[PDB]
Design an enzyme around this catalytic site. Sequence first.
Site, PDB file in Angstrom:
ATOM      1  N   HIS A 108      -1.774  -5.912  -1.654  1.00 36.49           N
ATOM      2  CA  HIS A 108      -1.366  -5.369  -3.003  1.00 36.49           C
ATOM      3  C   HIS A 108       0.122  -4.840  -2.753  1.00 36.49           C
ATOM      4  O   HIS A 108       0.499  -4.987  -1.502  1.00 36.49           O
ATOM      5  CB  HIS A 108      -1.987  -3.949  -3.315  1.00 36.49           C
ATOM      6  N   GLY A 109       1.177  -4.906  -3.653  1.00 33.43           N
ATOM      7  CA  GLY A 109       2.320  -4.507  -3.206  1.00 33.43           C
ATOM      8  C   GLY A 109       3.039  -4.027  -4.484  1.00 33.43           C
ATOM      9  O   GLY A 109       2.899  -3.941  -5.453  1.00 33.43           O
TER      10      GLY A 109
ATOM     11  N   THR B 195      -7.989  -2.035  -5.594  1.00 31.94           N
ATOM     12  CA  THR B 195      -9.115  -2.788  -5.778  1.00 31.94           C
ATOM     13  C   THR B 195      -9.299  -4.089  -4.336  1.00 31.94           C
ATOM     14  O   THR B 195      -8.131  -4.258  -3.957  1.00 31.94           O
ATOM     15  CB  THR B 195      -8.938  -3.762  -7.114  1.00 31.94           C
ATOM     16  N   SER B 196     -10.457  -4.531  -4.296  1.00 32.76           N
ATOM     17  CA  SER B 196     -10.499  -5.415  -3.339  1.00 32.76           C
ATOM     18  C   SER B 196      -9.944  -6.787  -3.846  1.00 32.76           C
ATOM     19  O   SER B 196     -10.047  -7.178  -5.034  1.00 32.76           O
ATOM     20  CB  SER B 196     -11.941  -5.725  -2.987  1.00 32.76           C
TER      21      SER B 196
ATOM     22  N   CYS C 214       2.274  -8.256  -5.511  1.00 33.20           N
ATOM     23  CA  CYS C 214       2.994  -7.855  -6.503  1.00 33.20           C
ATOM     24  C   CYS C 214       4.387  -7.164  -6.080  1.00 33.20           C
ATOM     25  O   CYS C 214       4.614  -6.772  -5.283  1.00 33.20           O
ATOM     26  CB  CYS C 214       2.230  -6.823  -7.309  1.00 33.20           C
TER      27      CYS C 214
END
EC number: 3.4.22.56
Lengths: 4, 4, 240, 240
Positions: free
Chosen positions: D93-94, D34-35, D135
């Site tokens: 993100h992660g 997601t953005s 994350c």
Amino acid sequence: DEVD
Amino acid sequence: DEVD
Amino acid sequence: SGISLDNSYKMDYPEMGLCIIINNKNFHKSTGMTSRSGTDVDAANLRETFRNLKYEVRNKNDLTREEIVELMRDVSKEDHSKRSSFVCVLLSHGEEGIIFGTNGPVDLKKITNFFRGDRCRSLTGKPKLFIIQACRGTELDCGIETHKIPVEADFLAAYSTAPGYYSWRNSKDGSWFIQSLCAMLKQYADKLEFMHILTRVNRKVATEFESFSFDATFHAKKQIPCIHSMLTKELYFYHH
Amino acid sequence: SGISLDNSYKMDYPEMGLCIIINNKNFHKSTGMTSRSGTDVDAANLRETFRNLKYEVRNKNDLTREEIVELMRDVSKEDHSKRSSFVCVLLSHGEEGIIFGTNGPVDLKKITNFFRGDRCRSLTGKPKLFIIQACRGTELDCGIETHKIPVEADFLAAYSTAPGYYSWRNSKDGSWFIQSLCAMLKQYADKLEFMHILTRVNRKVATEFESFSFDATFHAKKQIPCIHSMLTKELYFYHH
């Protein structure tokens, strides 16, 4: 609020 | 010297 | 009264708290794990060091994985209301995320979970310190020539070594990390905040130690400890 | 001259150093990611914050995994001799150990390795700071109602969240962690040592933020950042  |  | 600040943990409860030292030296032969020569030097240094900080020290030797879990469960169910903090020291073989009982491994996360903000209410808001002398993998550092709070809040894990790496123990002197930690606590516990003490420990281990081995693979290696802090305040072992 | 102490990094080189900000907002559709609404608020706050600390800030937006690795490689091969420190901020993100390029993941260890003591000699002995908003897994914190040096030495990873856990980002305000980090840097960078600043950030995130969601699974959750320090000295952004 959103999660990464 | 030794490693754990 | 006058203006107040609360940047530091309250450390003037009637008791400093427990210091649980798990000293695993001899392992069940079926595990194939070697005896950890020098670990008694570590355990004795820690006992004396934390005694002088006024911790109620409890030394435990050669605990099975079952005994480790039962101990942590039992200690987490004590009433810590009159205690400022909690300290647990783990001396054993290890891998990333894991420390070994004498008969098999224990998940580090499992150990710390007993003391979660929601699971040990008399330690909620108080610093919970885990000091870990154990390998975290098999990498060697070659060196270079120069309303609510989170349930995971108020934990600190002071790791002897970087993630993924071996940790070094001298069979005569004790482990590099515990040696250095006790020295810096003795010299600075009445002077410095705990992160600054642990930073001195980082520098001492990083600069003063280097392995000597007849094995080229294990010779001339270095170590850097790793501070894992989820603390929300400054921690001083002394109070005003 | 008189007695000298060297407990703190030398931060009076001609330059403070680079601050590389990787701001990944929009991801390739095939990744299904997601953005990250609100991340531009973060990137702008960081740019201004580190500008006022006299870092040479470089903002990068929407980088592929290949572009991230190439950037880190290239930056690690610059001459940092006249620079006091190095800072890299990752917004994406992660998962545990990982951050995402727009088209796939990059190993965090791979990124930091470019700046190892032996691989980037003009940063040897200087603080190398990695600030990570991403994350580290999918756990939610429910909260509770109240000669040589190591090649891995002189690294600090300031993680937005505990290992294994989601990290929270507000689409209007920016992420809890970056919001809090910039606020505490602005208020205390001329007063406090960096670990003590990051400890204030821990407390701010832990106390002042709690998720609001129409989804019961994701509602009323908490977050605690995690300081990962392998620094060997105290770090002050100001000098005498």
